[PDB]
Design a protein around this ligand. Structure first.
Ligand SMILES: CCCCCCSC[C@H](NC(=O)CC[C@H]([NH3+])C(=O)O)C(=O)NCC(=O)O
Ligand SMILES: CCCCCCSC[C@H](NC(=O)CC[C@H]([NH3+])C(=O)O)C(=O)NCC(=O)O
Lengths: 209, 209
């Protein structure tokens, strides 16, 4: 019943978990390797002290329970705290959308810092994937038109937070990315303004990734 | 004419070229996109005004001559200014070493920052590749012992500078990485203390990569 999240000092694959905790107002210890200096030694000492299944982070520890694999952690958390949808179909859709997010998020990460194929990403990959998500929001649109935007049903799911996080990452590095996608831009403003998320984000230190 | 080097605000693909210019004492303009605001917009405006063969940087402009492709630029510069060996065979060896540096450099860049496969990089690939270079260094032993270390022949080549740049970069992240490779470490210290290089490095700005 004591909750601790371990990861490096970065958003990366731990950020959606932090967002979920913030949304749900669950208190926990956000352990970031390297805050005490020397990320290498901490992570090394961490693998000695804790029984990780694949020697990787994020690791979420609940009391004595070691949980690994960010995706599995996200899905487990979401079922326990009721943001995994209201039906079996919607649970699937939230899941499907989260997997879609992983596809572009991966590409975004591979291009933003190194500028690797930045032009191809910004001209082909990004608008195509943003178009996919725009169309999903649209298919779910008259599930609350009153400035509430959800990808799945009439309630918030981890998919909303996952898409938020993704486009939160993208519009900062690439301002006005959302301008051609009105539903997606609105969705990003909506969830970003939810008080718990609004407070987490303003309190959130800047980071390289 | 005026030499202008065009790249993003980073070491990456341009640094070796800058090291060659520093080493040779060649004056040029080091134009860096995105020093002040969003590199992608500046790069976009650059391609509109400049005819590049592949719409990518680095670009080296000498007069109205436009040169693209970092590796080809290095070789051209190195042949022009006599740091490419002194026999057809040593010219090949410098080239071979450079290509080897690119294999390991790519791995270091792909795993540093994100930590994707860090322990694989650290316990397998880096030591392996460090051993390759150490071994190549030993093979050039007769090409003196007199506190001078070269990979090829008995004069500095761009391969020396490439290997330097490779471990200068790695040593930032993993500072003890050359403790088991004393000849490689001495090599690295020797290059870094050449007056033109020492000077360029002290004055060099810090970067994420
Ligand atoms: C933008 C984020 C992309 C970067 C991915 C790297 S996350 C850090 C890395 N862990 C993983 O790759 C975990 C992947 C796993 N599939 C998950 O989702 O948790 C690690 O423990 N690294 C330490 C090591 O391998 O030694
Ligand atoms: C760790 C450093 C390695 C990062 C690789 C990307 S360097 C920037 C990129 N250019 C290239 O990929 C050039 C590759 C070419 N083979 C070279 O070596 O010059 C670019 O112009 N990008 C802009 C664009 O595609 O729009």
């Amino acid at each position: 019943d004591n909750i601790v999240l371990y990861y490096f000092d970065a958003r990366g694959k731990a950020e959606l978990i932090r967002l979920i905790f913030a949304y749900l107002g669950i208190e926990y210890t956000d352990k970031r390797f390297g805050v005490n200096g020397d990320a290498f030694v901490e992570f090394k000492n961490f693998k000695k002290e804790k029984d990780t299944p694949f020697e990787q982070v994020p690791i979420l520890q609940i009391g004595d329970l070691i949980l690994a694999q960010s995706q599995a952690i996200v899905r487990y958390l979401s079922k326990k705290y009721n943001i995994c949808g209201e039906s079996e179909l919607n649970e699937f859709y939230a899941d499907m959308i989260f997997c879609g997010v992983q596809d572009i998020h991966y590409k975004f990460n591979n291009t933003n810092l190194f500028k690797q194929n930045e032009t191809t990403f910004l001209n082909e990959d990004l608008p195509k994937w943003s178009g996919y998500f725009e169309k999903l929001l649209k298919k779910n649109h008259t599930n609350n038109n009153n400035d509430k935007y959800y990808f799945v049903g009439n309630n918030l799911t981890y998919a909303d937070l996952a898409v938020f996080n993704l486009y939160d990452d993208i519009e900062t590095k690439y301002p006005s990315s959302l301008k051609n996608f009105p539903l997606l831009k609105a969705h990003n403003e909506f969830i970003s303004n939810l008080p718990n998320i609004k407070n987490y984000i303003t309190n959130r230190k800047e980071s390289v990734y």
